[PDB]
């Protein structure tokens, strides 16, 4: 890490002297950059703050290394694209000691090989975990998103309510907020399908709130369609206009797969 | 940091045990022992929390948060007091003046303040959030030639992570911003360069907002290169703003369209 600090600091034409204070001497900083000494994370954060770099930014330039969970996701990712049932199968044996992860691997794997599904008991251990969490992070959001097909609708709806009211984001990083918005829309789709208009109404209000003062045009475009679909299912002719506008957006942006997929929904349900 | 670790762990119903020793884990949490970032990252990893996420739960961030609060209120007196408070910080106060300018036109950074900032941006080997936000907010006070040179430096030497694409998204927006001025000023070599960079940045992303503004601005390019279909592209981008109820973007680009087309 000292190597990376050195590179970033020199890269900003900043002296070691200007970084030194009562917490770390010039000597301690040099010894750290050279790897002769280690410093505390807190003292590193102080240095970074002086360089106007936050520790999450520092970590990504230090190396392409990622967490266990992101490593899991990356593996699963490329296998799902290539339809390789085979190595998802022993990816699943590789993770057997990790209950929520393997439950999630089974959920994903079922989308290309339905013979494997998480058991009701496995899913229930996961939903119990999810209900038990006080703040939803990337982990809980991704677990819920990828296991949703195996959660009963009412538990899914209740889990969604928990997630939208308990996720964490900051002004500098809306990664989790964008995900929460996408999964809320996903629940809204199911709620409309099952004609739970109580649940639909709640979700529409939440989604509108989540999209306020944001860019997020992909979610706004999908929400234009889905809300229009909700409107249609309750006799507003405008709903079809909304859906046709969303189709045009996909079309205009050259998003052919999305265009095709939503136009298929339109021709079927409308 | 020991405090924030505790909360994150415990709000997951995770025991100290099943996570260093129980003692030192416990001991870091109570803010008694300092641990390395290496061991902190290891702990977060065990907790299935990213460092990006951990941070989300910092001088520059504090400044931005205050700016955001006052600007949203359009509160000129409060932004002037913020400017006072940061006057001894050169790039930060220049940026505050640039932002203030948009709601109080009498306030502007001086040529010399802007030059110190662009000298600094030019000197940085790798662009991060700080540099990107400074450029983006000070751009209306930077002459086009300097703006293009810095944009080229930024595009070719910024960093981002797969987990947090914040920087990549901002760089895309600022590249498009530069592109529309390059086309205004008929730097078509510049425009050609930026178009390739933007197309690369957009590849395998959603980023519908950037794609919508790019559809308009690339359409603008096409119109100036003699392709009449560019008009179609620009009108379609406007329709997208309209359909999504994006008033500001719609009326602003419609304005640009009426003057240029």
């Amino acid at each position: 890490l000292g190597k990376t600090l050195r590179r970033l600091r020199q890269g900003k034409q900043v002296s070691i002297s200007s970084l030194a204070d009562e917490h770390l001497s010039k000597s301690q900083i040099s010894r750290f950059e050279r790897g002769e000494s280690e410093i505390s994370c807190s003292r590193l954060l102080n240095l970074l703050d002086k360089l106007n770099i936050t520790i999450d930014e520092f970590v990504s330039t230090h190396s392409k290394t990622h967490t266990h969970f992101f490593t899991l996701l990356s593996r699963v990712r490329k296998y799902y694209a290539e339809k390789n049932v085979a190595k998802l199968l022993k990816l699943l044996e590789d993770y057997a000691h990790k209950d929520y992860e393997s439950t999630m691997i089974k959920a994903i794997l079922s989308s290309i090989e339905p013979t494997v599904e998480p058991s009701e008991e496995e899913v229930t251990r996961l939903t119990d975990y999810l209900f038990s969490v006080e703040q939803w992070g990337y982990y809980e959001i991704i677990l819920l998103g990828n296991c949703s097909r195996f959660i009963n609708y009412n538990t899914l709806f209740l889990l969604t309510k928990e997630m939208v009211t308990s996720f964490a984001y900051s002004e500098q990083n809306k990664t989790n907020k964008t995900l929460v918005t996408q999964l809320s829309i996903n629940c809204l789709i199911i709620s409309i399908d099952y004609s739970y208009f109580d649940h639909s109404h709640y979700l529409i209000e939440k989604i509108e709130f989540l999209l306020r003062d944001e860019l997020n045009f992909y979610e706004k475009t999908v929400f234009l369609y889905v809300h229009g679909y909700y409107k249609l299912k309750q006799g507003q002719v405008s709903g079809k206009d909304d859906m046709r506008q969303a189709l045009q957006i996909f079309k205009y942006l050259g998003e052919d797969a999305l265009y095709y997929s939503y136009k298929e929904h339109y021709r079927k349900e409308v | 940091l020991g405090k924030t670790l505790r909360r994150l762990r415990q709000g997951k119903q995770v025991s100290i045990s099943s996570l260093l020793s129980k003692s030192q884990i416990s001991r870091f949490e109570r803010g008694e022992s300092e641990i390395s970032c290496s061991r902190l990252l290891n702990l977060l990893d065990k907790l299935n929390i990213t460092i990006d996420e951990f941070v989300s739960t910092t001088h520059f961030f504090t400044l931005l948060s205050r700016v955001r609060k006052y600007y949203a209120e359009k509160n000129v007196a409060k932004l002037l007091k913020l400017l006072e408070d940061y006057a001894h910080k050169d790039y930060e106060s220049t940026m505050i003046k640039a932002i203030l300018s948009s709601i109080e036109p009498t306030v502007e950074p001086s040529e010399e303040e802007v030059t110190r900032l662009t000298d600094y941006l030019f000197s940085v080997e790798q662009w991060g959030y700080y540099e990107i936000i400074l450029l983006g907010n000070c751009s209306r006070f930077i002459n086009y030639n300097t703006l293009f040179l810095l944009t080229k430096e930024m595009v070719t030497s910024f960093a981002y992570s797969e987990q947090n694409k914040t920087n990549k998204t901002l760089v895309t927006q600022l590249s498009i911003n530069c592109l529309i001025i390059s086309i205004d000023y008929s730097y078509f070599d510049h425009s050609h360069y930026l178009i390739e960079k933007i197309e690369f940045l957009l590849r395998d992303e959603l980023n519908f907002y950037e794609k919508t503004v790019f559809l308009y601005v690339h359409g603008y390019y096409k119109l100036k290169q003699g392709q009449v279909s560019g008009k179609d592209d620009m009108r379609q981008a406007l329709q997208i703003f309209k359909y999504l109820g994006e008033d500001a973007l719609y009326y602003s680009y419609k304005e640009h369209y009426r003057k240029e087309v």
Binding site: L73, I108, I142, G145, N146, S148, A257 | -
Partner: peptide, 11 residues
């Protein structure tokens, strides 16, 4: 990458 829909998050 693209979510159409869930789908693989985040694929």
């Amino acid at each position: 990458x693209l979510l159409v829909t869930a789908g693989l998050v985040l694929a």
